[PDB]
Amino acid sequence: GPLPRTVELFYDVLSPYSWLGFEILCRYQNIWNINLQLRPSLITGIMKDSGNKPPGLLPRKGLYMANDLKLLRHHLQIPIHFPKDFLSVMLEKGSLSAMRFLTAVNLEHPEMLEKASRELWMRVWSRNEDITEPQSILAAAEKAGMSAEQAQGLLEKIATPKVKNQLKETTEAACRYGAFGLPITVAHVDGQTHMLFGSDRMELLAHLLGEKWMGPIPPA
């Protein structure tokens, strides 16, 4: 047994596939020999930088995504639900405030970041709730186990230079790694760096790390 391998996960709670990748890595983070670093990012920034556009906007792709996630819900046991209203609506509302809030968490209480992220996804991608209003974010944060005082204080820092710059810098790191969308997983292993896109490269990751893939729901 050697030292743990650092694995960076860049994600945005706006992204349904980011949630799937996030949960698989969280499930493996104390099974595999890895150091999982969560990297809250803005898909908006990545799209702009790369000249890419949200795949779901192409109707053939959007229809397929709804089918795919409905199956993945059961396969991965993550309560992901496609929104009742059109995707364009959720996309248009976006996730700027939520991702700024997750950034403030990472800056001050990174030990809370996994739960705060999960609770935000539970709003937008499970129960089909808003993630743009202050009250919506506070609700997710209290769900994560954050005191009201604690959550309020972080929310207050959403528009501060420190938080705004950190989110921008994390998002550009993803771009420098070659992102055109999210999630991306960056594994630093045996002296090389590998960037993997999507939630469907975790078995390949296990291979690169020399670890055993036991499916998306490993036994505890």
Q: Find, among 207, 21, 25, 216, the residue nearest to 125 by Cα.
A: 21
Q: Pick the closer one to ligand GTX by CB: 117 or 199.
A: 199
User: Residue 75, interface with a copy of itself (CB under 8 A)?
Assistant: yes
Between CA 48 and CA 86 the distance in angstroms is 22
The footprint of ligand GTX on residues 177-196 (CB under 6 A) is: 180-182
Q: Of these partners, ligand GTX, a copy of itself, none, which one is at the site of residue 44 (CB under 5 to 8 Å by kind)?
A: none
Half-sphere exposure of 113 (CA within 13 A, CB side): 24
- Of 65-73, 101-109, 149-157, 167-175, the window that binds ligand GTX (rule: CB under 6 A) is 65-73
Helix (H, G, I), strand (E, B) or coil at 168: helix
Binding mask 18-57 for a copy of itself (x = CB under 8 A): --------------------------------xxx-----
How many other CB atoms are found less than 10 A from the CB of residue 194?
Answer: 17
The footprint of a copy of itself on residues 129-158 (CB under 8 A) is: none
Name the one residue in this structure whose structure tokens are 């710059």.
Answer: 165
Sign of CA dihedral 69, 112, 180, 55: positive
Angle, nearest 10°, between helix axes 43-50 and 161-176?
A: 50
Between CA 21 and CA 10 the distance in angstroms is 10
Any known ligand binding at 182?
yes
Given 29, 49, 73, 91, the residue binding ligand GTX (CB under 6 A): 91
The residues of the shown chain that bind a copy of itself, judged by CB under 8 A, are 50-52, 58, 60-61, 63-64, 67-68, 71-72, 74-75, 178-180, 194-198, 200-201, 203-204, 207-208, 213, 215-216
* Binding-site residues from annotation for glutathione: 15-17, 52, 182, 199-200
